Amino acid sequence: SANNPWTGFQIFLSPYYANEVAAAAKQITDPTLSSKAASVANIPTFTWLDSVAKIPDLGTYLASASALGKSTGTKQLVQIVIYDLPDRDCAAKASNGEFSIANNGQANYENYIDQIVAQIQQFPDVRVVAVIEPDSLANLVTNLNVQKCANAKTTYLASVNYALTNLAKVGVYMYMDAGHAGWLGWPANLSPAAQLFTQVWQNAGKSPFIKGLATNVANYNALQAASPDPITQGNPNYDEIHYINALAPLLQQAGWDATFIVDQGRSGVQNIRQQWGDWCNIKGAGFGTRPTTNTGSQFIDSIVWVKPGGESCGTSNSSSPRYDSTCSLPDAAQPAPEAGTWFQAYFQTLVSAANPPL
Numbered sequence: 417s418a419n420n421p422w423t424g425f426q427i428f429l430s431p432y433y434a435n436e437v438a439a440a441a442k443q444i445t446d447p448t449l450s451s452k453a454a455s456v457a458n459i460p461t462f463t464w465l466d467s468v469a470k471i472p473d474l475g476t477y478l479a480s481a482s483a484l485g486k487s488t489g490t491k492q493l494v495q496i497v498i499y500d501l502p503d504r505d506c507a508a509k510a511s512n513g514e515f516s517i518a519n520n521g522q523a524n525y526e527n528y529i530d531q532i533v534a535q536i537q538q539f540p541d542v543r544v545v546a547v548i549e550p551d552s553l554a555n556l557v558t559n560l561n562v563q564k565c566a567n568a569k570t571t572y573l574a575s576v577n578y579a580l581t582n583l584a585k586v587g588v589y590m591y592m593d594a595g596h597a598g599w600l601g602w603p604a605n606l607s608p609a610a611q612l613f614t615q616v617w618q619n620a621g622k623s624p625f626i627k628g629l630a631t632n633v634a635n636y637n638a639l640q641a642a643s644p645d646p647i648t649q650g651n652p653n654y655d656e657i658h659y660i661n662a663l664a665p666l667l668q669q670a671g672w673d674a675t676f677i678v679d680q681g682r683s684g685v686q687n688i689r690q691q692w693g694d695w696c697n698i699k700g701a702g703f704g705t706r707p708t709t710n711t712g713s714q715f716i717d718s719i720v721w722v723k724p725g726g727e728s729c730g731t732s733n734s735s736s737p738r739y740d741s742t743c744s745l746p747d748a749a750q751p752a753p754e755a756g757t758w759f760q761a762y763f764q765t766l767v768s769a770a771n772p773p774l
C-alpha cells in the first residue's frame with residue numbers, strides 16, 4: 417500500500433540477539449564460518465515479548481533506538497512480537513505461557529499490554545512494528561475441537577482485541593499472526609480465516625494501524641517455491657505467496673486493504689520435513705532470504721525474520737515439565753534445550769546452510 421511501515425526507517429538491531437550471535441560465533445571453530453556467523457548480528461530480527469519479564473528490555477530498546485536515530489540523523493524502527501496470551505498455544509502439547517484463563521488470565525494480559533503501551537508512549541520518535549500473538553487466532557479457525565482452544569476462544573478474541581485497540585492508541589503498526597500456507601492456506605480454510613480476521617479488525621475499530629497479517633512466523637515454508645515441497649500434497653497453495661495471493665482479495669472485499677509480512681528466517685532450506693505440521697527445531701534448516709521490502713508482491717510489505725534462528729523451540733527431553741513430543745520427532749534436531757534458550761548446534765547449521773549464503 418501507500419504506507420509501508422519500513423520505508424524511510426532504519427531497523428533497530430536486537431542487542432539481545434546480537435549478544436547471542438556474538439557468543440555463538442566465537443564458539444564456531446572454522447574461522448570463515450565464524451565470521452559469517454558473526455555478521456548475523458547485523459540482520460534485523462523481531463524481539464519476542466513472551467513474558468512480562470521482557471517488558472523492561474522493550475523500554476531499553478526504544479530508548480536506545482531513539483538515541484541512535486539522533487546520533488545518526490535517522491528514524492528508527494523497533495520490531496516486537498506480542499506473545500503472552502492466557503492459555504497460550506491452546507492446541508500444543510505443552511505451552512510456556514505464564515498466564516492462565518483460570519487465574520485472572522485476561523486481566524493479567526491486559527496489564528501486560530498496558531505496561532508495553534506505557535513504554536511505547538514515552539518514545540514517540542521511534543516507530544514500532546508488532547506481530548500480534550503467533551499460534552493464537554489460527555487455532556480458532558481449524559482447532560475448535562481442541563477443548564483447550566474451544567475454552568480459550570472468547571479470551572483469545574478479547575485479549576487480541578485489547579492488544580490491537582490499545583497499541584493502536586500509541587501508533588504501533590500491527591500484523592496479526594495468520595499461520596502459514598499449510599495451516600490457513602488450504603483453500604477450504606481461506607474463507608473462515610478471512611471471516612475471523614475481518615471480524616477482529618472490525619471489533620478493534622478498523623484502525624489504519626492494523627496493517628494486515630504476518631505469515632510463516634517461526635516456520636519454514638518457502639515464500640515462492642521452485643517446486644512444491646512433498647509435504648504440501650493436496651494444497652494448491654504450497655508456499656506463502658500462493659496463500660497470500662488467495663487470502664488478500666478476501667480481506668479486500670470486506671473493506672480491509674490488508675498487507676502482509678512473511679517470516680523467512682529459517683526458510684533457506686526446503687524439503688526438510690516429513691509432515692507439514694512438524695514445526696519444532698526442524699533439522700537442517702538454513703537462514704533464508706534476508707529481510708527486505710523488495711518482496712515482489714503488491715500484498716507483502718516486507719520479508720522479515722520474526723523467529724530468531726538459534727533459539728530453541730522446545731526441549732527434546734521427555735522428562736522436562738515443558739516437553740512437547742513434537743520436539744523428539746525424527747525430523748527434529750536433537751538433543752534440544754528448553755524453548756528460548758540458545759541451541760548452538762542448530763545455529764551453526766543455520767549459518768552453514770544459509771541460502772542465500774551469508
Ligand SMILES: *[C@@H]1O[C@H](CO)[C@@H](O[C@@H]2O[C@H](CO)[C@@H](O)[C@H](O)[C@H]2NC(C)=O)[C@H](O)[C@H]1NC(C)=O
Nearest residue numbers: 731732733734735736737738739751752753754
Ligand atoms: C530432563 O528433564 C528432567 C526434569 O526436568 C531433568 O532431571 C532433573 O534435573 C534437575 C536439575 O538438574 C534435578 O534437580 C532433578 O533432580 C532432576 N530430576 C530427574 C528425574 O532426573 C533432567 O536433568 C533433564 N535432562 C537434560 C539433558 O536437560
